[PDB]
Amino acid sequence: SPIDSADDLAKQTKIEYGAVEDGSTMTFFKKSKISTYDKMWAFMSSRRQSVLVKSSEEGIQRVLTSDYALLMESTTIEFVTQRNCNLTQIGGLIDSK
Amino acid sequence: STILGFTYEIRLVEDGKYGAQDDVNGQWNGMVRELIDHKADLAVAPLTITYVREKVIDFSKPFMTLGISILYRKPNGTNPGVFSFLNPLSPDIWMYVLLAYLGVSVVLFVIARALSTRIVGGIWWFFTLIIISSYTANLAAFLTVERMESPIDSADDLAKQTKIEYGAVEDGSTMTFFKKSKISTYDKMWAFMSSRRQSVLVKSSEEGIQRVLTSDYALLMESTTIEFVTQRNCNLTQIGGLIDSKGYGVGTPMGSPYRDKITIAILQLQEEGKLHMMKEKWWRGNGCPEQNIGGIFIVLAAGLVLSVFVAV
Amino acid sequence: LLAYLGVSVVLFVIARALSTRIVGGIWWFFTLIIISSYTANLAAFLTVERMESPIDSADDLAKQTKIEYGAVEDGSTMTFFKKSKISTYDKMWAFMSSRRQ
Amino acid sequence: ANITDSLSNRSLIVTTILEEPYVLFKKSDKPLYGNDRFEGYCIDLLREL
Numbered sequence: 001s002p003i004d005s006a007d008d009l010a011k012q013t014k015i016e017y018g019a020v021e022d023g024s025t026m027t028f029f030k031k032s033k034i035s036t037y038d039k040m041w042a043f044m045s046s047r048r049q050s051v052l053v054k055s056s057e058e059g060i061q062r063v064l065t066s067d068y069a070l071l072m073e074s075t076t077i078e079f080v081t082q083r084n085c086n087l088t089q090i091g092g093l094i095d096s097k
Numbered sequence: 098s099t100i101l102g103f104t105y106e107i108r109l110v111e112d113g114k115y116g117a118q119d120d121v122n123g124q125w126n127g128m129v130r131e132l133i134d135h136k137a138d139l140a141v142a143p144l145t146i147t148y149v150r151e152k153v154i155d156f157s158k159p160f161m162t163l164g165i166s167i168l169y170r171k172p173n174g175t176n177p178g179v180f181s182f183l184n185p186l187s188p189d190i191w192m193y194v195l196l197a198y199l200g201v202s203v204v205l206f207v208i209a210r211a212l213s214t215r216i217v218g219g220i221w222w223f224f225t226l227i228i229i230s231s232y233t234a235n236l237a238a239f240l241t242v243e244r245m246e247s248p249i250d251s252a253d254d255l256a257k258q259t260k261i262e263y264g265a266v267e268d269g270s271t272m273t274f275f276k277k278s279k280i281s282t283y284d285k286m287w288a289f290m291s292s293r294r295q296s297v298l299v300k301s302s303e304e305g306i307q308r309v310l311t312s313d314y315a316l317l318m319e320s321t322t323i324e325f326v327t328q329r330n331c332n333l334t335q336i337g338g339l340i341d342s343k344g345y346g347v348g349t350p351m352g353s354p355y356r357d358k359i360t361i362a363i364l365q366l367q368e369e370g371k372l373h374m375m376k377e378k379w380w381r382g383n384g385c386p387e388q389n390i391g392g393i394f395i396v397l398a399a400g401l402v403l404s405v406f407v408a409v
Numbered sequence: 410l411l412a413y414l415g416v417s418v419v420l421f422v423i424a425r426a427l428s429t430r431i432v433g434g435i436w437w438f439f440t441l442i443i444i445s446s447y448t449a450n451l452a453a454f455l456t457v458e459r460m461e462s463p464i465d466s467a468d469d470l471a472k473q474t475k476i477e478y479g480a481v482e483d484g485s486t487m488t489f490f491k492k493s494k495i496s497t498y499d500k501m502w503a504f505m506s507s508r509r510q
Numbered sequence: 511a512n513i514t515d516s517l518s519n520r521s522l523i524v525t526t527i528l529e530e531p532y533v534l535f536k537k538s539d540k541p542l543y544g545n546d547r548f549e550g551y552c553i554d555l556l557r558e559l
């Protein structure tokens with residue numbers, strides 16, 4: 001496919017997916033309730049200091065220097081794949097806000 | 098009202114949801130909040146007799162029984178014709194072949210005017226081998242893939258992928274049911290939805306029907322609704338058996354004794370059969386009674402005549 | 410048969426060359442499709458018939474709700490799943506309990 | 511709507527953090543200072559704010 005939704009990533013543990021640390025996204029999954037998102041969480045928390053990032057720009061690095069998939073906010077994704085075109089968005093909006 | 102001895106004020110519930118608890122507050126909504134607060138008395142409504150709803154108010158006896166089932170396109174999906182046969186090979190590459198053809202022929206055109214011809218004849222014969230071989234595999238890999246997956250018709254069939262989206266209406270007992278499911282098919286079928294809550298959940302049956310028509314999208318429904326919905330549209334059809342079974346009830350507050358003649362006055366009429374002949378009435382199923390092979394038969398039919406105009 | 414006829418007839422219009430250097434070639438390159446058409450559509454069915462286990466473990470059944478699996482009522486087996494703890498066996502249970510009687 | 515200057519006389523601490531394209535260090539032909547050091551959607555928002 002390879003990937004089109006979150007759950008694509010959620011099942012297969014052969015890709016790094018994480019999110020900026022102490023960001024609503026992090027607090028989202030952590031405090032989320034849905035099966036997937038909880039299962040997505042415990043993946044990250046299984047690799048806390050290694051999948052998480054301190055700045056998106058640094059989380060951007062992971063994508064372009066690893067097998068990474070950053071749980072980024074849309075508007076930034078929407079943006080960062082304006083300037084730099086070596087990247088892509090996967091799927092729709094997890095959480096409206 | 099003629100057998101109980103009541104009168105009646107019709108009201109649409111404001112929010113327009115059937116009604117099920119909120120996640121955390123424990124509170125209900127839809128009709129259900131009204132009838133628990135007692136804001137209204139009667140819900141002679143298209144109602145789902147779930148246990149939670151029994152836990153909070155009381156319905157009539159289960160008189161219009163049902164059980165969840167799927168709604169989906171027919172769909173009459175076809176694309177036969179000449180415009181199909183290209184697929185195993187690039188339409189551009191389909192063209193080069195002619196250019197790639199005359200190459201050899203125009204060579205013999207000049208050679209004669211037989212080692213040399215023959216020893217090139219391989220790099221045609223062996224050449225086109227590459228193509229027809231490539232063709233076949235490119236043909237197969239199209240079919241097998243486009244064959245192993247579909248056609249499928251069951252709730253479990255949906256669980257086999259995400260490439261046929263599905264859902265129901267919010268506060269759907271059905272939704273709730275799949276939310277409240279411990280069935281590694283249906284359990285899985287939930288986890289899908291509540292990730293894509295919005296694209297899958299609609300506000301009414303009718304709205305969602307368009308989701309069946311706007312996209313490849315099955316839809317979960319209570320059984321009796323379904324056939325009629327197809328009976329009123331010969332663009333749709335129904336998938337699989339019944340997920341479960343339940344009925345429609347008549348909405349009153351918890352043990353609020355209005356039901357007590359409702360406990361009686363319903364049956365007789367269907368104990369007669371009126372409601373069923375009324376079921377007949379509003380469910381008059383008026384209507385909807387319940388290839389790429391050929392894309393080259395024409396190219397077959399193309400050189401046939403192309404010979405007739407050669408010499409005569 | 411039809412095309413195989415409609416080409417073969419021409420000799421009966423000849424009697425009663427590029428003329429044929431076009432027919433057979435298109436014919437060949439036509440009938441060189443049917444075989445691949447056939448071939449794939451065979452393999453397209455064979456491989457699909459190399460996909461069915463169908464069942465070898467409990468969990469085979471546990472996942473797919475297109476087969477009835479149950480147990481004698483009030484038997485240790487029934488009480489086993491009901492009072493079981495394992496994911497599957499619990500998931501196997503709630504299937505039955507979804508269709509108790 | 512003449513709320514406009516009714517909050518003018520005053521000043522509050524604006525905290526923030528750096529992220530393109532919301533807030534990021536202004537680019538400098540010559541060294542940068544204070545609430546001019548930065549540029550970004552939120553930066554150029556605050557002005558309007």
Ligand SMILES: C[C@H](C[C@H](N)C(=O)[O-])C(=O)O
Binds near residue numbers: 022023025072073
């Ligand atoms: C940028 C975002 C933080 C998010 N704006 C918040 O308020 O926590 C993230 O880390 O994914």
Ligand SMILES: C[C@H](C[C@H](N)C(=O)[O-])C(=O)O
Binds near residue numbers: 115116266273317318
């Ligand atoms: C939308 C519908 C609601 C259902 N009739 C109920 O009463 O909750 C459903 O089946 O999901």
Ligand SMILES: C[C@H](C[C@H](N)C(=O)[O-])C(=O)O
Binds near residue numbers: 482486487
């Ligand atoms: C036969 C067995 C009951 C089992 N012997 C018991 O003791 O419960 C079953 O119902 O599967």
